[PDB]
Design a protein around this ligand. Structure first.
Ligand code: YML
Ligand code: MG
Lengths: 277, 279
């Protein structure tokens, strides 16, 4: 396919996932970019994947697409089936992965602004609960903060499915080989070099210093099975967020929680939305 | 075609050639490699590009292929015609640039130099060897010369360094980086492949690192007479440099055209110098 995919495959084999991700971030510097939300080259209209009952003033769920180069439109499909007849579920695209190939955001705030504008158009008067998994969970919180700070519109809630935020990333660093193998095992087509570069750019965004914390309440959803090997004496390997409103534990590991066990995630979400409403 | 070439083009367009070279070097670490000279995936047999007169003990020229991703077997064709009827000229490939699946990259520079060394000794027989290289290839010519002396008990009779910019003197390289990157696209016969760009990055990194040994062979330093781009006089001298060369020759042209349009002048300097060192 592309040279970057070949290099990534070898990096994962040599257990140097983290090193290759840094290479992807540096290389992404030399891809054409958009520097203002207006200049975004793609249409970020959310897609409706599930319909709630008709019909009021009930929150709609917005799935925040994660950074995985093998991801995209498929990401929330299995999960969304469990929301049909319960809640509207909209998936918003992550800028820079589209289509000529899409312009990359110059910085994270620029991509978040683009997403915020598309979400606010789609949602209308309805309250919004943001949902993301893994790197998308980190992005869901960053979006939530930006909606609040810069768009006068804090979401009604955030659902963070297995987040590993800065300061709490040791297990995900220890398991980077499995993460890399999961990306390859989860391919439907070969990961494009353009999307690999997008993934590196966002990974770098998310390691950088961020402006603060959203006031929206948080549901922390955690996998119950470790993705790889872990010594008990090393501490808790589990996903982490500071002082969540509610915590839910679901079957599966970092990956299988969202497919195999997607109904369990959905059930935790539906219960929580009832509680906060 | 290939993402790396598109990225490279943008980097040059944006005056970030140096930064992009670093990225190529880091990326190249994830290419399949050869760790021993024997494990080299390519036939490094030198090509005879010019023949000396039929009339023992006379030095043969060996063209050390440079690092440019747009190079290869065509590199010494113009220069070599001027050696016809004067000296044998053999051109040795640089490991990591071939095809046939693409070529393995050297794990380290010494590994690539040993592969070349064995090919050269086999091809040259008993004849004394004079190594020749231009730019990146001039740096490689010296490193090979030192490796031949140290690891093969076979110091060359001489080294011809055409426009070298060694680690102590790379301000002109930095100041003209845009022109150097554009020169690389200008000199494309076909689109530089991603595999070759990664090779070029891997070698640039090799040539930045600690290389302690100095060849005992005498050096002819051949210098371009024209600046490749604008240069502020107070920066110092823009010309190519080598520490304590045996002889220095200035030729017409710039860094590129000295070989492109003025190769006969380069051959003439080499031939005069070879006569002087031989007797
Ligand atoms: P020359 O090969 O035209 C340019 C150089 O002398 C520079 C300093 C050298 O480091 C080479 C190895 C960089 C390559 C990218 C140019 O082929
Ligand atoms: Mg000196």
């Amino acid at each position: 396919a592309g040279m970057f995919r070949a290099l990534f495959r070898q990096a994962v084999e040599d257990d140097r996932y983290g090193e290759f991700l840094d290479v992807l971030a540096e290389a992404s510097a030399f891809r054409p970019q958009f520097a203002s939300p207006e200049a975004c080259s793609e249409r970020l209209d959310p897609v409706l994947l599930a319909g709630g009952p008709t019909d009021e003033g009930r929150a709609v769920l917005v799935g925040c697409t994660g950074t995985a180069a093998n991801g995209g439109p498929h990401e929330f499909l299995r999960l969304s089936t469990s929301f049909q007849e319960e809640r509207d579920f909209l998936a918003v695209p992550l800028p820079g992965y589209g289509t000529g190939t899409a312009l990359l955001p110059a910085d994270l705030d620029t991509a978040l602004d683009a997403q915020a504008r598309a979400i606010l158009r789609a949602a209308g008067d309805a309250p919004v609960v943001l949902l993301g998994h893994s790197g998308g969970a980190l992005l869901a919180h960053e979006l939530a903060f930006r909606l609040e700070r810069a768009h006068g519109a804090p979401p009604a809630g955030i659902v963070l499915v297995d987040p590993y935020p800065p300061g709490h990333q040791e297990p995900i660093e220890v398991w980077s080989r499995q993460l890399g193998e999961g990306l390859f095992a989860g391919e439907l087509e070969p990961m494009s070099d353009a999307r690999l570069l997008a993934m590196g750019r966002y990974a770098r965004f998310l390691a950088g210093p961020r402006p603060g914390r959203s006031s929206a309440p948080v549901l922390l959803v955690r996998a119950s099975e470790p993705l790889g090997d872990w010594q008990e004496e090393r501490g808790d390997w589990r996903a982490h967020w500071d002082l969540p409103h509610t915590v839910a534990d679901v079957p599966g590991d970092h990956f299988t929680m969202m497919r195999d066990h997607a109904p369990a995630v959905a059930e935790a979400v539906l219960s929580w939305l009832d509680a906060i409403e």
